[PDB]
Amino acid sequence: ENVSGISAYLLGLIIGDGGLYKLKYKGNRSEYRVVITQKSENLIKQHFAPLMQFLIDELNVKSKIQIVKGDTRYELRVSSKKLYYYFTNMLERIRLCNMREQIAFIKGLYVAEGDKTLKRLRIWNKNKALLEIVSRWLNNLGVRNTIHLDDHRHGVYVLNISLRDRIKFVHTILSSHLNPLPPEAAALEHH
DNA sequence: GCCTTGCCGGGTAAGTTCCGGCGCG
DNA sequence: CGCGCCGGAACTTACCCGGCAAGGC
Ligand SMILES: [Cl-]
Ligand SMILES: [Mn+2]
Ligand SMILES: [Mn+2]
Numbered sequence: 160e161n162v163s164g165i166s167a168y169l170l171g172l173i174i175g176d177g178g179l180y181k182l183k184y185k186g187n188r189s190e191y192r193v194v195i196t197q198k199s200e201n202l203i204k205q206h207f208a209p210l211m212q213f214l215i216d217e218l219n220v221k222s223k224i225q226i227v228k229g230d231t232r233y234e235l236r237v238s239s240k241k242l243y244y245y246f247t248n249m250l251e252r253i254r255l256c257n258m259r260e261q262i263a264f265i266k267g268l269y270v271a272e273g274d275k276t277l278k279r280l281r282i283w284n285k286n287k288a289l290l291e292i293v294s295r296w297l298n299n300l301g302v303r304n305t306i307h308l309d310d311h312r313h314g315v316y317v318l319n320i321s322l323r324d325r326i327k328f329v330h331t332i333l334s335s336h337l338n339p340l341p342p343e344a345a346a347l348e349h350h
Numbered sequence: 351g352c353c354t355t356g357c358c359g360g361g362t363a364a365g366t367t368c369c370g371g372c373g374c375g
Numbered sequence: 376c377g378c379g380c381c382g383g384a385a386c387t388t389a390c391c392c393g394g395c396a397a398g399g400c
Contacts, residue, residue: 176390178365185369189379198363222380229384232363238380271364274391279355283390307356313389322354 160259162217164338165210167256167263169195170246172207174289175271177235179247191243195235200226203233206342211237218245254292261296262331263338268293270341277343280320280328283309290318302328 173179177195184190195211197203208224215222215237222239256264274281284290290306297304302324309317320328334344 176364180366182367184378187377189377190381191379194365196364225382227383229364230386232365234365234384236382238382240379272390276392278393281355281391285389305355309357310390311358315389315391317356319355 161338162214163260164263165214166246166249167260168267168338169207169210169214170249170253171264171267171269172271173246173267174250175268175284177271179243179250181243190238191240193237193239193242193246196229196232197235198232200228200233202342203235207235210339211235215239215242218242258300259337261300262335265293265296265332266335266338266341269333275343277325277329280322280325281309282318282320283315284318285313285315287316290316294318297328300327300332302332 172195173193176197177193180190180192180194182190182192193211195203195207197207203226208226211224214220215224218241220237220239220242222237222242225234225236225238227234227236253264269282272282272284282290282293287306294304294306297318297320303321305319305321306316307319309315329344329347333341334348340348
Protein backbone atom coordinates (compact mmCIF):
# COMPACT_ATOMS: atom_id res chain seq x y z
CA GLU A 160 0.00 0.00 0.00
CA ASN A 161 3.08 2.19 0.57
CA VAL A 162 0.86 4.39 2.75
CA SER A 163 0.38 1.43 5.11
CA GLY A 164 4.12 0.78 5.15
CA ILE A 165 4.95 4.40 5.98
CA SER A 166 2.13 4.44 8.54
CA ALA A 167 3.53 1.39 10.34
CA TYR A 168 7.06 2.83 10.25
CA LEU A 169 5.89 6.11 11.78
CA LEU A 170 3.87 4.22 14.40
CA GLY A 171 7.05 2.46 15.54
CA LEU A 172 8.77 5.83 15.87
CA ILE A 173 5.73 7.30 17.64
CA ILE A 174 5.25 4.42 20.08
CA GLY A 175 9.01 4.42 20.58
CA ASP A 176 10.30 7.99 20.77
CA GLY A 177 7.03 9.91 21.00
CA GLY A 178 3.38 9.33 21.80
CA LEU A 179 -0.27 9.98 21.11
CA TYR A 180 -1.81 12.59 23.39
CA LYS A 181 -5.41 13.70 23.99
CA LEU A 182 -5.24 17.03 25.82
CA LYS A 183 -7.92 18.87 27.79
CA TYR A 184 -7.37 22.57 28.45
CA LYS A 185 -8.98 25.61 29.96
CA GLY A 186 -11.68 25.41 28.96
CA ASN A 187 -13.20 23.48 27.56
CA ARG A 188 -10.50 23.61 24.89
CA SER A 189 -8.77 20.45 23.69
CA GLU A 190 -5.96 19.16 21.48
CA TYR A 191 -4.90 15.89 19.86
CA ARG A 192 -1.19 15.36 19.24
CA VAL A 193 0.98 12.96 17.27
CA VAL A 194 4.54 13.32 18.53
CA ILE A 195 8.04 12.06 17.77
CA THR A 196 10.95 13.38 19.83
CA GLN A 197 14.64 13.11 18.98
CA LYS A 198 17.90 14.84 19.85
CA SER A 199 19.08 15.14 16.23
CA GLU A 200 17.06 17.86 14.48
CA ASN A 201 18.64 16.73 11.21
CA LEU A 202 17.05 13.30 11.68
CA ILE A 203 13.69 14.90 12.50
CA LYS A 204 13.74 17.46 9.67
CA GLN A 205 15.31 15.26 6.99
CA HIS A 206 14.03 11.72 7.68
CA PHE A 207 10.97 11.80 9.95
CA ALA A 208 9.16 14.95 8.80
CA PRO A 209 9.12 14.18 5.02
CA LEU A 210 7.51 10.81 5.76
CA MET A 211 4.94 12.38 8.09
CA GLN A 212 4.21 15.10 5.52
CA PHE A 213 3.50 12.49 2.84
CA LEU A 214 1.06 10.71 5.17
CA ILE A 215 -0.60 14.04 6.02
CA ASP A 216 -1.09 14.73 2.31
CA GLU A 217 -2.47 11.29 1.43
CA LEU A 218 -4.94 11.42 4.34
CA ASN A 219 -5.98 15.02 3.48
CA VAL A 220 -5.08 16.16 6.98
CA LYS A 221 -4.79 19.95 6.96
CA SER A 222 -2.76 20.27 10.17
CA LYS A 223 0.88 21.26 9.79
CA ILE A 224 4.08 19.59 10.96
CA GLN A 225 5.45 21.58 13.90
CA ILE A 226 9.11 21.20 14.85
CA VAL A 227 9.60 22.53 18.39
CA LYS A 228 13.02 22.87 20.02
CA GLY A 229 13.07 21.63 23.61
CA ASP A 230 15.73 21.87 26.29
CA THR A 231 16.98 18.31 25.70
CA ARG A 232 15.52 17.26 22.32
CA TYR A 233 13.51 18.36 19.32
CA GLU A 234 9.83 17.50 18.93
CA LEU A 235 7.98 16.67 15.72
CA ARG A 236 4.34 17.46 16.46
CA VAL A 237 1.12 17.19 14.45
CA SER A 238 -1.95 18.69 16.15
CA SER A 239 -4.71 16.70 14.45
CA LYS A 240 -7.66 14.80 15.90
CA LYS A 241 -7.98 12.88 12.63
CA LEU A 242 -4.32 11.81 12.67
CA TYR A 243 -4.43 11.02 16.40
CA TYR A 244 -7.24 8.49 15.99
CA TYR A 245 -5.69 7.21 12.75
CA PHE A 246 -2.63 6.05 14.69
CA THR A 247 -4.59 5.16 17.83
CA ASN A 248 -6.90 2.78 15.96
CA MET A 249 -3.88 1.33 14.15
CA LEU A 250 -2.27 0.63 17.54
CA GLU A 251 -5.26 -1.31 18.90
CA ARG A 252 -5.35 -3.27 15.64
CA ILE A 253 -1.57 -3.85 15.53
CA ARG A 254 -1.84 -7.64 15.96
CA LEU A 255 -3.42 -7.83 12.47
CA CYS A 256 -0.55 -6.27 10.49
CA ASN A 257 0.53 -8.18 7.41
CA MET A 258 4.21 -9.04 7.00
CA ARG A 259 5.01 -5.77 5.21
CA GLU A 260 3.54 -3.61 7.98
CA GLN A 261 5.24 -5.80 10.60
CA ILE A 262 8.68 -5.23 9.08
CA ALA A 263 8.03 -1.49 8.82
CA PHE A 264 6.86 -1.27 12.44
CA ILE A 265 9.89 -3.22 13.69
CA LYS A 266 12.04 -0.85 11.62
CA GLY A 267 10.58 2.22 13.32
CA LEU A 268 10.60 0.66 16.78
CA TYR A 269 14.28 -0.25 16.44
CA VAL A 270 15.21 3.24 15.22
CA ALA A 271 13.48 4.53 18.36
CA GLU A 272 14.29 1.89 20.98
CA GLY A 273 17.08 -0.19 19.48
CA ASP A 274 20.80 -0.66 20.04
CA LYS A 275 22.14 1.60 17.29
CA THR A 276 25.65 0.11 17.42
CA LEU A 277 24.36 -3.13 15.83
CA LYS A 278 27.12 -4.84 17.80
CA ARG A 279 24.17 -6.18 19.81
CA LEU A 280 20.54 -6.28 18.68
CA ARG A 281 18.33 -5.12 21.56
CA ILE A 282 15.02 -3.27 21.95
CA TRP A 283 14.11 -1.63 25.27
CA ASN A 284 10.60 -0.85 26.49
CA LYS A 285 8.49 -1.07 29.64
CA ASN A 286 5.55 -2.38 27.57
CA LYS A 287 6.21 -6.11 27.75
CA ALA A 288 3.03 -6.96 25.82
CA LEU A 289 4.25 -4.89 22.87
CA LEU A 290 7.61 -6.68 22.94
CA GLU A 291 5.88 -10.07 23.04
CA ILE A 292 3.99 -9.08 19.87
CA VAL A 293 7.28 -8.15 18.20
CA SER A 294 8.84 -11.36 19.52
CA ARG A 295 6.27 -13.58 17.79
CA TRP A 296 6.64 -11.55 14.58
CA LEU A 297 10.42 -12.04 14.66
CA ASN A 298 10.11 -15.78 15.35
CA ASN A 299 7.71 -16.18 12.41
CA LEU A 300 10.31 -14.32 10.33
CA GLY A 301 13.02 -16.76 11.44
CA VAL A 302 14.77 -14.39 13.87
CA ARG A 303 15.37 -15.99 17.26
CA ASN A 304 15.01 -13.72 20.28
CA THR A 305 14.45 -13.56 24.03
CA ILE A 306 12.78 -11.12 26.43
CA HIS A 307 14.07 -10.40 29.94
CA LEU A 308 13.75 -7.64 32.53
CA ASP A 309 16.86 -5.61 31.73
CA ASP A 310 16.33 -2.66 34.12
CA HIS A 311 15.20 -3.82 37.56
CA ARG A 312 15.13 -0.21 38.80
CA HIS A 313 12.48 1.10 36.40
CA GLY A 314 10.87 -2.06 35.03
CA VAL A 315 12.30 -1.80 31.50
CA TYR A 316 12.31 -5.05 29.54
CA VAL A 317 14.64 -5.78 26.64
CA LEU A 318 14.08 -7.90 23.54
CA ASN A 319 17.44 -9.43 22.64
CA ILE A 320 17.77 -10.62 19.05
CA SER A 321 20.18 -13.55 18.91
CA LEU A 322 23.42 -12.72 17.11
CA ARG A 323 23.12 -16.13 15.41
CA ASP A 324 20.62 -14.46 13.05
CA ARG A 325 22.09 -10.94 12.97
CA ILE A 326 22.42 -11.10 9.17
CA LYS A 327 18.81 -12.24 8.80
CA PHE A 328 17.59 -9.36 10.98
CA VAL A 329 19.73 -6.61 9.46
CA HIS A 330 19.33 -7.64 5.81
CA THR A 331 15.73 -8.86 5.58
CA ILE A 332 14.09 -6.54 8.15
CA LEU A 333 16.14 -3.39 8.76
CA SER A 334 17.19 -3.18 5.10
CA SER A 335 13.90 -4.01 3.36
CA HIS A 336 13.00 -1.88 0.34
CA LEU A 337 9.26 -2.57 0.75
CA ASN A 338 9.10 0.39 3.17
CA PRO A 339 11.34 3.39 3.92
CA LEU A 340 14.90 2.54 4.93
CA PRO A 341 16.16 3.48 8.41
CA PRO A 342 19.12 5.89 8.44
CA GLU A 343 21.82 3.38 9.40
CA ALA A 344 20.58 0.68 7.01
CA ALA A 345 20.44 3.24 4.19
CA ALA A 346 24.03 4.33 4.87
CA LEU A 347 25.15 0.69 5.01
CA GLU A 348 23.57 -0.16 1.66
CA HIS A 349 24.99 2.90 -0.11
CA HIS A 350 28.34 2.43 1.69
C1' DG B 351 39.97 -18.83 23.25
C1' DC B 352 36.14 -16.28 22.27
C1' DC B 353 31.61 -15.55 21.10
C1' DT B 354 26.94 -14.88 23.12
C1' DT B 355 23.97 -12.74 26.32
C1' DG B 356 21.90 -12.03 31.30
C1' DC B 357 22.48 -8.41 34.39
C1' DC B 358 23.90 -4.22 35.82
C1' DG B 359 24.80 1.18 36.78
C1' DG B 360 25.34 6.01 34.46
C1' DG B 361 22.94 9.88 32.84
C1' DT B 362 20.76 11.90 28.98
C1' DA B 363 17.75 11.51 25.23
C1' DA B 364 13.69 10.97 25.51
C1' DG B 365 8.54 11.29 26.78
C1' DT B 366 4.49 13.83 29.16
C1' DT B 367 1.43 17.64 30.16
C1' DC B 368 1.01 22.04 31.26
C1' DC B 369 1.09 27.37 29.47
C1' DG B 370 -0.46 31.15 26.26
C1' DG B 371 -2.68 32.03 22.22
C1' DC B 372 -6.17 31.73 17.78
C1' DG B 373 -9.98 30.18 14.51
C1' DC B 374 -14.72 28.65 13.79
C1' DG B 375 -19.72 26.97 14.19
C1' DC C 376 -19.77 29.04 24.50
C1' DG C 377 -17.69 24.69 23.03
C1' DC C 378 -14.22 22.61 20.65
C1' DG C 379 -9.99 21.94 17.91
C1' DC C 380 -5.34 23.77 15.80
C1' DC C 381 -0.67 26.68 17.03
C1' DG C 382 3.81 27.55 19.50
C1' DG C 383 6.47 27.04 23.63
C1' DA C 384 8.86 24.51 27.27
C1' DA C 385 8.73 22.86 32.20
C1' DC C 386 9.63 18.57 34.36
C1' DT C 387 10.67 13.60 35.46
C1' DT C 388 12.60 9.01 33.84
C1' DA C 389 12.68 5.49 30.39
C1' DC C 390 15.41 4.34 27.75
C1' DC C 391 20.34 3.35 25.35
C1' DC C 392 25.00 2.86 26.26
C1' DG C 393 28.67 0.04 27.53
C1' DG C 394 31.17 -2.86 31.07
C1' DC C 395 31.27 -7.39 33.46
C1' DA C 396 31.43 -12.14 33.68
C1' DA C 397 28.68 -16.80 33.55
C1' DG C 398 27.93 -20.16 30.32
C1' DG C 399 28.81 -22.84 25.98
C1' DC C 400 31.12 -24.76 22.44
CL1 LIG D 1 19.49 19.55 21.44
MN1 LIG E 1 9.95 4.54 24.33
MN1 LIG F 1 15.48 6.90 20.64
